[PDB]
Design a binder for this molecule. Structure first.
Ligand SMILES: [Mg+2]
Ligand SMILES: [Mg+2]
Lengths: 104, 53, 74, 136, 177
RNA sequence: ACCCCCGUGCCCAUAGCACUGUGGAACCACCCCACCCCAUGCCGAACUGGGUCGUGAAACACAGCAGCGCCAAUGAUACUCGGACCGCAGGGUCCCGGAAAAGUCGGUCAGCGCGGGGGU
RNA sequence: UCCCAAAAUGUAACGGAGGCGCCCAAAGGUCACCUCAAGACGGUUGGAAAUCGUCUGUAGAGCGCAAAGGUAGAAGGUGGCUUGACUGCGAGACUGACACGUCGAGCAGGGAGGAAACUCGGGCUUAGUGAACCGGUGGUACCGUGUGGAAGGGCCAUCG
């Protein structure tokens, strides 16, 4: 049950990668799209759909992902390595990926 | 690496035009007929490659 | 029976404190006793090796999971 | 006496006493004072003999089961490997190991049973009394 | 069809007899697993379709032929061979079969007297000891192969047996008084 | 600044289980629906899409509790590097250092970071 | 493969035990998903085990075979797609008296799976094999004793 999230954490190499990693918490209706450093346990841009949602808790799946990439432009990020938990990369979570891969 | 009538055998490799061997230890035990694959020989690559002698 | 036997080998090759090089073999083992740390790769036969230059570093978190990292000098 | 199932062979080594205690499962006890090998047959020797001196009771404990197989010479020669798998079982015993212990009976009734079951043994022994309280 | 009486004749009747502080803590019905005894003593490749079809017409769902546990004892046991069957009903299809069991199944049974009242699973669940299959509204001996038995298991979300027995009887379950 | 919640690290049982209490719409979970994108060799349990009420029961978080786990002295002892001896022998002793295990005292059911959110 | 082996490695005996001379188009690569043995309680051809359900459960299972190590974030179990069980190479190391054997990042020509980072040059590893000579087959064209061919010979692979 907790195996799905770890299978993508041990999988996504941290150090040897050199890259960063983007997490995602969409088991509910509250995506964070938090971005985390490979060595340092800090956070850079950190997106979330908490500050308003305009009555949308499902459709903003792509709005937050566009907001993220744009929010990352102010830091200097080129490469992002995604790290979903128990998410088979379907729809709600796919919108983030797509939106933060062309909006960057 | 014994070699008798027993099941499984050492296989020569051919190709569409290509003239190259892969040397593979097959076996007549289960599905024993479709010994076809895709091993690019020195060449453009992507050649139909069946070890089936 | 007297018959049967095997020379065998295994063990550790690069100990901690030592200065490795890109390709030096660190520890040989059968299973996964020493897990590949930072700077250290792992062969089919769980044979640990080094990717670049640096220093041998052992890490132990209460047995079970061993780790070996390489701290570059420069 | 003999084990019900084991590996078969063994080796040989004598260190100091480890798991031997002054008193348990009774009041009086008998302790060795010399390292040696106590044969299975020797244990039968002691047990039977103490049962002759004790008509009823059955309060005779023997917690030194032999767990040590020994080899033996079948005939002659030396052109061979493990010789004599089945010979006898011996239980190792180190000074301060309790072999025997009795209870219910008096003082005199105990000085006889240990005495007697002392002459059979390859080593010296002494009989003790209570005043030990280590673990329980 | 059902569900309406599943609540009114249950939930409100529970806070008026016990004392729930929540409509969520109210004992519910999770699933009804059906097991099929096949093979072993009766190793027949024909008997497999006998149950495979019938089970798929009585509960309206394709069952799964659970093989052996890879255990080879002294008697007739093999490594990995279809011997068991699993028919888990939950949700819509659950109440569909359940209702049929309380209205037609149990009532329409020869020498029927009821079911053992003693508390069965002591974890808040319950189990049924169904046997003969010639007592179902879907099973027609005039168009089958042979005659066999089936096992039904009632899986609920009760905490205790006291709250389980209540739920079962109120929903529709006869007992031998 | 105060506190709390959520996400994610270091640490990876002296930070674990059990028992008990607290938390109700900021957050979390259950729950409701789910013909279709997707999916459980059967079941939308779990994945999953669209979202009210209700509830906090369960889960989770926190707090007390330490009966149980875990961690674990001091002293002494086993053993041993070194030196020096005894018995016919299985063995054993003295001097000088290092120094267990177990058990006991006792210790504590963490601490230390980053980001975001909602409250005073 | 363990033990002897006396806490690096190594170390003998007609010392103590148990295996191998294979297997697999998948048990491969990769990509996703599932988590065990057993006991207790209650249930129908059962009545020991087993089929089902619910709890306990650092796994006391499993990993094709012998054993040890190791594995719960899997080297446990399934499914989709594939033929990297590829070719031309290999800094630097382990190991041996030599000969062999073992691990390997990276680079190149081309492919596989995934959105992707990334991984893959056989299978959890350690046995499942053996020099040279001689010969068979395919390939490629270097030699070919006057020249141009050919026989033959070499080389690449591979078989006995
Ligand atoms: Mg040694
Ligand atoms: Mg010759």
């Amino acid at each position: 049950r907790r195996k799905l999230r770890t299978r993508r954490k041990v999988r996504t190499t941290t150090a040897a990668s050199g890259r960063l990693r983007l997490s995602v918490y969409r088991s509910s209706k509250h995506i964070y799209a938090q971005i985390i450093d490979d060595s340092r346990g800090q956070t850079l841009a950190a997106a979330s759909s908490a500050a308003l949602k305009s009555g949308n808790k499902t459709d903003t799946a792509a709005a937050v992902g566009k907001a993220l990439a744009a929010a990352a432009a102010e830091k200097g990020i080129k490469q992002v390595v995604f790290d979903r938990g128990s998410y088979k990369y379907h729809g709600r979570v796919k919108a983030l990926a797509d939106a933060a891969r062309e909006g960057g | 690496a014994k070699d008798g009538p027993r099941i499984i055998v050492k296989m020569e490799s051919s190709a569409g035009t290509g003239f190259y061997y892969t040397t593979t230890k097959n076996r007549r035990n289960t599905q024993a007929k479709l010994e076809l694959k895709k091993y690019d020989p020195v060449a453009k690559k992507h050649v139909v490659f069946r070890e089936k002698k | 029976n007297g018959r049967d036997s095997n020379p065998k080998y295994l063990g550790v090759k690069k100990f901690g404190g030592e200065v490795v090089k890109a390709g030096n073999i660190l520890v040989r083992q059968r299973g996964t006793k020493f897990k590949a740390g930072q700077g250290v790769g792992m062969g089919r036969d769980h044979t640990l090796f080094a990717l670049s230059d640096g220093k041998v570093v052992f890490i132990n978190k209460g047995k079970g999971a061993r780790f070996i990292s390489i701290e570059a000098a420069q | 006496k003999r084990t019900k199932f084991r590996k078969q062979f063994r080796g040989r080594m004598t260190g100091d006493a480890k798991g031997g205690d002054y008193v348990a499962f009774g009041d009086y006890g008998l302790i060795a004072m010399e390292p040696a090998w106590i044969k299975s047959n020797q244990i039968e020797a002691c047990r039977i003999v103490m049962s002759r001196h004790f008509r009823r009771g059955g309060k005779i404990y023997i917690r030194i089961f032999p767990d040590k197989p020994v080899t033996k010479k079948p005939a002659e020669t030396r052109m061979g490997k493990g010789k004599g798998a089945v010979e006898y079982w011996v239980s190792v015993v180190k000074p301060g190991r309790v072999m025997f212990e009795v209870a219910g009976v008096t003082e005199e009734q105990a000085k006889e049973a240990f005495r007697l079951a002392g002459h059979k043994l390859p080593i010296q022994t002494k009989m003790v009394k209570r005043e030990v309280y280590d673990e329980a | 069809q059902l569900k309406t009486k599943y609540n009114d004749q249950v939930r409100p009747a529970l806070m008026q007899q016990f004392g729930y502080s929540s409509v969520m803590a109210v004992p519910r019905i999770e699933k009804i697993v059906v097991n099929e005894g096949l093979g072993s003593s009766k190793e027949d490749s024909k008997a497999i379709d006998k149950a495979a079809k019938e089970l798929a017409l009585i509960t309206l769902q394709k069952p799964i032929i659970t093989k052996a546990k890879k255990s080879i004892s002294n008697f007739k046991l093999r490594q990995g061979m279809p011997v068991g069957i699993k028919v888990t009903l939950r949700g819509e299809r659950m109440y569909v079969f359940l209702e049929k069991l309380i209205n037609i199944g149990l009532p329409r049974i020869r020498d029927f007297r009821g079911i053992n009242p003693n508390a069965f699973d002591g974890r808040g669940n319950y189990n049924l000891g169904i046997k003969e299959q010639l007592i179902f509204p879907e099973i027609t001996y005039d168009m089958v192969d042979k005659t066999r038995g089936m096992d039904i298991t009632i899986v609920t979300t009760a905490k205790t047996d006291e709250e389980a027995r209540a739920l079962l009887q109120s929903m529709g379950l006869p007992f031998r008084k």
